[PDB]
Ligand binder design. Sequence first.
Ligand code: HDE
Ligand code: HDE
Ligand code: HDE
Ligand SMILES: [S]
Ligand SMILES: [S]
Ligand SMILES: [S]
Lengths: 726, 726, 308, 83
Amino acid sequence: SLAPEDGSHRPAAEPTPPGAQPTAPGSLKAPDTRNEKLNSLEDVRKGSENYALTTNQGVRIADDQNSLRAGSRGPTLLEDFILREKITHFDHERIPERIVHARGSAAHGYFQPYKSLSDITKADFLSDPNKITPVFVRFSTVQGGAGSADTVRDIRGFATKFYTEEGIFDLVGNNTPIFFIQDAHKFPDFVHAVKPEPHWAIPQGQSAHDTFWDYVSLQPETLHNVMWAMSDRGIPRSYRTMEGFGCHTFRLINAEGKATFVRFHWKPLAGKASLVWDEAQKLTGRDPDFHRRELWEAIEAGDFPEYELGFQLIPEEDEFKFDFDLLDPTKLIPEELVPVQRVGKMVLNRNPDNFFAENEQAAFHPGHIVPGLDFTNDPLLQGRLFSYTDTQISRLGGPNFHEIPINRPTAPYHNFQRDGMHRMGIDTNPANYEPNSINDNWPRETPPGPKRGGFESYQERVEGNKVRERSPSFGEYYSHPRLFWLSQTPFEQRHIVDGFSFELSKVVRPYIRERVVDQLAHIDLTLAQAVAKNLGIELTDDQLNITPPPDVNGLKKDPSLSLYAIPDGDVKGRVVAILLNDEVRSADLLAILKALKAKGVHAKLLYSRMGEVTADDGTVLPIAATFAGAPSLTVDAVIVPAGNIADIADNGDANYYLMEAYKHLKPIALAGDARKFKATIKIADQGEEGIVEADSADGSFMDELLTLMAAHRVWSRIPKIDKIPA
Amino acid sequence: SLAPEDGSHRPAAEPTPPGAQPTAPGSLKAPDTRNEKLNSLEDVRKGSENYALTTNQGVRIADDQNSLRAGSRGPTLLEDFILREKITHFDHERIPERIVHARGSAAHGYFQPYKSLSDITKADFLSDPNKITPVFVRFSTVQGGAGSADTVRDIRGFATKFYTEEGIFDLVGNNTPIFFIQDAHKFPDFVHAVKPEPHWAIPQGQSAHDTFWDYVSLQPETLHNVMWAMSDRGIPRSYRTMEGFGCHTFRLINAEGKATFVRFHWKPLAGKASLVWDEAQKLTGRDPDFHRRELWEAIEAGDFPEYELGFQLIPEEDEFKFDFDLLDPTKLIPEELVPVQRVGKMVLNRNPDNFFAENEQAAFHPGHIVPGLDFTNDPLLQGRLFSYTDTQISRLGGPNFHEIPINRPTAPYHNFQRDGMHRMGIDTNPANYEPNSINDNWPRETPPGPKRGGFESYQERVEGNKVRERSPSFGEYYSHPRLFWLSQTPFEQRHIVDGFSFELSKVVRPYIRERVVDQLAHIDLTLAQAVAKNLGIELTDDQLNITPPPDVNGLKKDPSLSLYAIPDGDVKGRVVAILLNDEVRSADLLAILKALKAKGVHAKLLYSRMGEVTADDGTVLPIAATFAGAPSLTVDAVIVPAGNIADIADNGDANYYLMEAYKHLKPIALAGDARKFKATIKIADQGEEGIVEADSADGSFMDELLTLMAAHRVWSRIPKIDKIPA
Amino acid sequence: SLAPEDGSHRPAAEPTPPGAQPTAPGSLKAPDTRNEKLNSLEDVRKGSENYALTTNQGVRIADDQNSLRAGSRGPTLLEDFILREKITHFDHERIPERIVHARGSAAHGYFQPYKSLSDITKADFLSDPNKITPVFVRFSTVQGGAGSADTVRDIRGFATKFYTEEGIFDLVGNNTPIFFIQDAHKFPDFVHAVKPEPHWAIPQGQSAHDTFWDYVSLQPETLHNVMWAMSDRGIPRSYRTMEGFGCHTFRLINAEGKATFVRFHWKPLAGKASLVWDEAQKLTGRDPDFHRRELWEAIEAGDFPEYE
Amino acid sequence: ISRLGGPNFHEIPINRPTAPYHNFQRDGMHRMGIDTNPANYEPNSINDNWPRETPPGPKRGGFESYQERVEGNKVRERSPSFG
Ligand code: HDE
Ligand code: HDE
Ligand code: HDE
Ligand SMILES: [S]
Ligand SMILES: [S]
Ligand SMILES: [S]
């Protein structure tokens, strides 16, 4: 017995806030959270308590501390089969990482539609509001390895595996509504350009290098998703606070055989929020696991990630009614033109048990559709259909990857396929071919029908010659970048300029920077000039006269493209740093902690050391982390209670905590004599918007703080930080 | 519905004789035959009847006859995910075959001890006659690939996986008591020498080529197993009629920790029986699946293969009591010196459902032992311990091969190993290391003990320097070949001479043949002379004067080494061909079948076409096969009843059937006018021992036939067969 | 020295008739034969005479007869890297065999066109009667595994890899002009039917079983190729004496962009010849390697397989 | 075996010895070397036993292990001197 007698090694099996208890496997943290998929995995879940340690062959091990040797200082013997099994398994633990989206964090949950969608699709999962579909979702970055950092500037993946009664449906989306390239044939060129360069394998998790910008400069189709990546969209606060999109026009197919074009949306019910660049970059160093950690802890805390599934629906007859081609994956469909219709709600409510087994081996692929859905001729989507099945053969070791437990359908599956590496299912069918008489032709084909029918493709008319040719309709590259730019707030536009400027400054060959600047001048002159100024580049008279691209169907902005133009803030699940001193005013802390609790906002009590401090009234205050150990990067706001301020007033880390949080536009609240820290961040006596201050933490001090937090960051402070040395 | 109206597509789920029903997966043929392992495989068995045809993702297929194309004569579309999944699975069906023993046939069964062996071993499966242990046994040849022929001349493997309550114990044996080589380091040399030669990959399933005999002539340690292989041991009639041996001295360890040396044996309860060379070779062409079919059909019929497990036990103080080394795996322990103690019975009573999933993916390894057993320093066994774990990494795709259903222990298995390709187990343990506090150190080590204890190696004393050196005590190569030779009957000796003669005639380089004959002269002059005569070689004066090797501890023979010296026949499960005519004397056939049934001997009714014939009393007789379709090679004896003989009397195939059976020493019975056939095999009017003849098939006629069948073959006929052109 | 004094261990490096000499690797048998592809493989050919025996890491081995143990009757030691490297390579020698056509026999050769075909195709290997194209050809059965018998009744494969100056062109044909099925979606159904049945994995190298004929009886499209398989075409005498076919209509495309439909043929210059069934079936027993042996020994004799 | 896909990892260019290497090992996935040796085993007469073992000695000799003395029982036990 090595566990502590007080049982403090084991986390409570109840929802607890971030940092209160060690984290655990989902079935141990939340044993009563169930769904049909989680239940169906019970056959392979393996426990441990009270069991004897064995080899894989079930042989009990007596000494797991020593190899077998001739004499206690002698050579190890080949007949040590316990040593060799154990080391063999270790020696083969690793499998190939995903070619792209290798870095990803995942969770189980469930989806339910708001109402039946039978008028527009025969998809069984969308047929009845009382139909619950288990999901498994993996969020990811794109470029970096499985051991790269979470808060890089990159697109994010948002993949949802729906375990439906009529088969697996994978909705394999991203956090922007378009992609960099038009045709799947170029995907290796694009990916190679953004990935670490091949001579030296640098840089990790970054597009800020020559080959990416070289490619972008020579392939203007990429400019739209580049605008998105350079904006604060490229640096989300949390997977809970970004949008999701299905990237392509697909089809819905109803029982009557009518096709409707659809683009898929996920709206984050926690709101849209992003970091700022300096914060995101520094955070890759201070906690490269920050998003994986935040997702896991939100789920353990009961702050379940929730998203609303939405559809943009376009009738068959309206295929050609836009300025852009619906099948072009570099074009978005503005919500002002085609609204998103609410469809249903997904809640992620349980972490996995074993990350490797459930997360690393999960296979998602957009060809996994079900009756009631179908594809289109989008030439990016068309190639994806090839890639996601082929790649599993090396990644997951062969064609039986659907038998890896997380991948298994909960719907029945029976067919005539046999064998392959790792074959688990033992087929008893006397036949392995059809048609057969020896088993009366079972399992049998099923006609298409309104429910429970076989899959049949929509009979779309095809007419043309066999060509390798880009549609002329796809040859417009600047209008959507422009629409995106004009839709952003002035502070968002500033962060876009700064992303381009920062990234191009890492491009070693100056001609590439110049070429990119030329492309910016084809989108918007103010943008092009601002980036040019940061790069010491002067636009030519010609570049000054490039006429801007047309409006998109008469639109000059669409506010749904902004993260922040329309408020959607939610504070629940956010976190506040509380900077302790050695004699805190206990009435300030009561008021602070209860107000945060009442709104679902977490707190972490920080100090210059671990252990405890004692408040004015003798209350013993447990310390979560030190100032340097849990930097302001990791919180949404900072509160300093009154008390013995002289304890920390000269602590460099405590001052720096506030400068860093100030620079990154976070709300800061100072009570009583904590107002002496005003001088550290240079705040005028009469105060400033975004700094909450009062004699004490009572009255409106906490409501004012929470109002700031609902608006995420203090954008008005941007001109003030510009000269802060932090 | 494609099945016939009369339901004759489905085999009866009751025991039926060979050829009476189509064969079937074991769980459909014998659904109520159970054991703990067969039951535990229920979670992975998949049926088929009344299920819809789907993709692997659970999506119902409407049309499994066509690819999706643009028009019905148009190009196939990349978006056809149904086609690609189905073709992808097909394209990756195959896994590497085993490096050796790739050709093999397997069945489920059980083992039970005759009494408790706790005085000599604490192995839990041997602790009580009530302890029933599920087994899965795979029989094999050695050289040929998985698609090679069964009735080759080769050593056979006999591998038994014991699913004990204290772990998997694999007893991985062969059908002779020794091996060709002494030290594992030479295994690839020997195996490369026997296998098809590397320039052109010829010959398949044969040792009868230059490189094998080149290696043998240069490595006299091989000569002992070579003698076995060249005897009729190399061509068993049936996996049911051959012996098994564990090849090495292992140890038993009892609760007091006392070690006893042991060699393992399996004694076939159906007795020992082999083919003759001409018959075996021809059989590789008429039915290369003969042994696999014969095993499957024996089990379907209720002729369950039964073997008695036997131990040769040698106290530790008797290590040096013999004039050979106990650790030298080219040496056998004569039963005259150390008798075999009969320990328990294994019965094989159920075929697999899916050959690939259960047989091809099964992994046996002699290092899979349990507490109560242990190894010795046998330097061939020592290197085996390395290879059987290492080879599964490519063959079965990674280190989780124990999770493949057939391989899973039925005993509990828990440890801290994680990940690896196609990981099925989802571990919930917070800890993946020990010692740990976070899971109170579970799963925990277990001290060795009398029952349910951890594995601890027997503390054998090791004293010597680190050397690559063969023990001087291994340096004797001819005494055991000689003892084996002298123990054979005169007809077994002739067949050995013929095996060496035939093989060496296929060796193109004549000096190799000469060098092998030189080695034979070191074993026995009469043998060496007989083979030399067949090769047109004359022994030199030196070779005629080589002193024979010494007896083995005073033994000049041991009849346990002979297949046939001690009567051991069992006719149950054997098969007789009955050559029909278009008007059979029904009273002969009634008697014939009645008597065969009372002894559990099967019959096949043969004619010159399929369909039926009609006997003299109007009995309709269904025909199993033509004369050419089911050759005498596939039966143990031939009966020709009376009736219209003129019908078949000039049938070439009918006459040849008897010539072929006669040549191969099989019992032939002729009734009434069937004695007209004595003419074709040149039998004197007064008769011949081994030919049963009478006016009719009365009671004594069948008794004499069944007596001959108990003695397997008519060895006295050998001098008569030289003159027969067959 | 282990070789005999009279050098009779070494096959004569000159054409010799079947059975006259032991067979040998090609580059030792016929070192004067060459073509562009054979020359290009020289960088990976490894000899052997006069070299020391080494690990794969280039370390010379002193004793390749024993494992390293603690005393000459003691246990084998984990530090024996020479033993583990040699046994690890052996343990992993096998790769998956081909799903179909797993049994086959191959040789190097060359191809030359009789005249330029530039009026009907711009394919460079057909543009000049002086242009010689190295080939590597594999002949095969279809159903059985890599260790199954040659003279089974089955379709035969006839695959030619042309190493052209404008890329590899593979002409992947069979010895009949058609196939059993119409649409590739059914290929795993037909292949599963003809292959060994899934419960017991019987029969090897034979369509003579229930599932094959069940499929045929339910899919009359198969009858045409079934007729060919049931004829003596299904049991050829030699890969040298069978026809080859490209199976499908392909297209030739000339320099002007004109498309012409094309079906490909190989005509055996040694003529057409097949066994009879009783002989072919017994021969699978007496010599399951007869066609592989026959091909190899024909080339060693200078009876080179020729095809138009 | 998993990381580099088989036992021919020494043939991956970076891994290849510059010193000669010849032996009787054959096949494995993505086998690069084409062996011409009539023999793939030793001892052989058909290639006069090449490539051959080499005795140990001062330079260019075969590898032989130092003959360290081993005395002890087969134990899974940590040396007391390590404690
Ligand atoms: C719409 C969102 C989106 C788009 C447009 C693309 N990816 Fe993704 N991707 C793979 C290939 C692939 C291709 C061929 C294309 C355009 C032709 C895209 N991508 C663009 C992949 C290599 O097959 C992939 C890697 C491993 C795998 O299983 O499939 C793959 C990953 C991926 C993910 C991660 C899913 C997960 O396992 O967590 C996501 C969210 C996307 N892609 C989105 C996506
Ligand atoms: C005595 C019974 C016996 C002996 C002495 C040996 N074999 Fe076997 N063999 C493998 C390697 C190996 C070595 C290294 C040695 C002596 C050093 C022996 N053999 C001699 C193997 C390559 O590891 C093997 C191939 C596939 C596999 O999983 O292990 C292997 C197979 C094998 C079988 C087949 C078991 C089965 O899969 O059905 C049998 C019965 C033997 N060996 C017997 C055996
Ligand atoms: C026309 C000659 C012919 C035809 C019509 C087909 N095969 Fe072959 N085959 C493979 C798959 C395949 C499919 C999907 C179809 C129709 C849908 C055919 N076959 C019909 C394969 C599984 O991809 C295959 C196995 C290994 C491989 O590399 O490809 C394959 C083999 C094969 C060969 C063997 C070439 C060789 O290595 O000697 C030949 C001659 C054919 N097929 C001919 C063929
Ligand atoms: S996309
Ligand atoms: S053995
Ligand atoms: S074909």
